């Protein structure tokens, strides 16, 4: 509360560390469905159904331009990528399985880096 604070966690490396995580996600062989925005002119149903599209290139641009106020807003966009994928793709599809694999890969890096 006012003049009453928990001890200051060092957040000065967060930006760099989120960038490294994102590089590792970018270079995973199952990243291909997530590298670029879904083409809303060429994929029927996507625009109407997926209210907040997100992809790795969009996260990278947001990261690079100081549009993440903290590491939690960064994790929310990464997870949004996988949540969108589960909304639109059957679990038993190449893309559906890609999304599950990438979400697992991400959550481990996240826990190991920050928890």
Q: What is the CATH number of the domain that holds 72?
A: 1.20.920.10
* Consecutive H or E run containing 46: helix 46-49
Work out the end-to-end distance of the chain between its first and last CA atoms, rounded to an integer number of angstroms.
24
Of 64, 57, 11, give the one whose Cα is nearest residue 37: 57
Decide: 38 and 53 in contact? Cβ < 8 Å.
Answer: yes
Q: Find where tokens 């694999």 sit.
A: 101
Domain that holds residue 105: 1-115
Question: What burial class does residue 11 get, using C-beta atoms within 10 Å of its C-beta: 0-12 exposed, 13-18 middle, 19+ buried?
Answer: exposed
**Resolution in Å, one decimal place:** 1.8
**Method of determination?**
X-ray
| Domain count along the chain | 1
With residue 107 as reference, give the H or E element that holds it.
Answer: helix 94-114
50 secondary structure, DSSP code: -
The C-alpha atoms of residue 34 and residue 30 are separated, in whole angstroms, by: 9
């Amino acid at each position: 509360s006012m003049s009453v604070k928990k001890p200051k966690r060092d957040d000065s490396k967060d930006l760099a560390l989120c960038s490294m995580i994102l590089t590792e996600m970018e270079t995973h062989e199952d990243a291909w469905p997530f590298l670029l925005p879904v083409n809303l002119k060429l994929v029927p149903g996507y625009k109407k159904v997926i209210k907040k599209p997100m992809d790795f290139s969009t996260i990278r641009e947001k990261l690079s331009s100081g549009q993440y106020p903290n590491l939690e807003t960064f994790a929310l966009d990464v997870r949004l990528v996988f949540d969108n994928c589960e909304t639109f793709n059957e679990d038993d599809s190449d893309i559906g399985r890609a999304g599950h694999n990438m979400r697992k890969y991400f959550e481990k890096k996240w826990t190991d880096t920050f928890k």
